[PDB]
Amino acid sequence: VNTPSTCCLKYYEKVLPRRLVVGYRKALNCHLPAIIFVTKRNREVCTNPNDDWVQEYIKDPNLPLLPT
Amino acid sequence: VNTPSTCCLKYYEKVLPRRLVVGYRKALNCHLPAIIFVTKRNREVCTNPNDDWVQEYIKDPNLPLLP
Ligand code: NA
């Protein structure tokens, strides 16, 4: 659309501890496709959708998809 | 900064009525640099920073930058 999107410009280079993550948002339609993890520290973290740990957290039955 | 940004993926293709817009945001460090207009209904519209009308609108002291 002509409406702005939430998009990532860089990927996080480390693994977020699972215990710190409370949800995720999809930002896959951007120039750099990303998954954004929402944390207990009230931070939003851009990550590589293709990385193994990211796909593990996405598949976690207790982690909700949140809107952007 | 691994924090998300607000970015535009395409530009609106018409000229917005000035009466409709109430502020603007800058999204120039994106793959497609844009000026985002905010409407009185709090909708956001992506536009080309280089269009003459866009620059004239944002130069208006009564149309503020909203970060
Ligand atoms: Na202005």
Nearest Cα to Cα of residue A5 among B44, B48, B42, B47? B44
- The whole-angstrom separation of Cα A12 and Cα B43 is 30
* Technique used: X-ray
Q: How far is A59 from chain B (nearest CA, A)?
A: 22
- The whole-angstrom separation of Cα B57 and Cα A44 is 33
Judge contact between B7 and B26, C-beta under 8 A. no
The boundaries of the domain holding residue B47 are 1-67
Number of domains in chain B: 1
- The whole-angstrom separation of Cα A41 and Cα A37 is 11
Which amino acid type is present at position B5?
S
- The whole-angstrom separation of Cα B16 and Cα B39 is 10
- The whole-angstrom separation of Cα A29 and Cα B30 is 13
Judge contact between A24 and A57, C-beta under 8 A. yes
| Chain B residues inside the 8 Å CB shell of A43 | 3
CATH code: domain of residue B1? 2.40.50.40
Nearest Cα to Cα of residue A28 among A4, A45, A47, A41? A47
| Chain B residues inside the 8 Å CB shell of A47 | 2
Which amino acid type is present at position B15?
V
Q: How far is A52 from chain B (nearest CA, A)?
A: 18
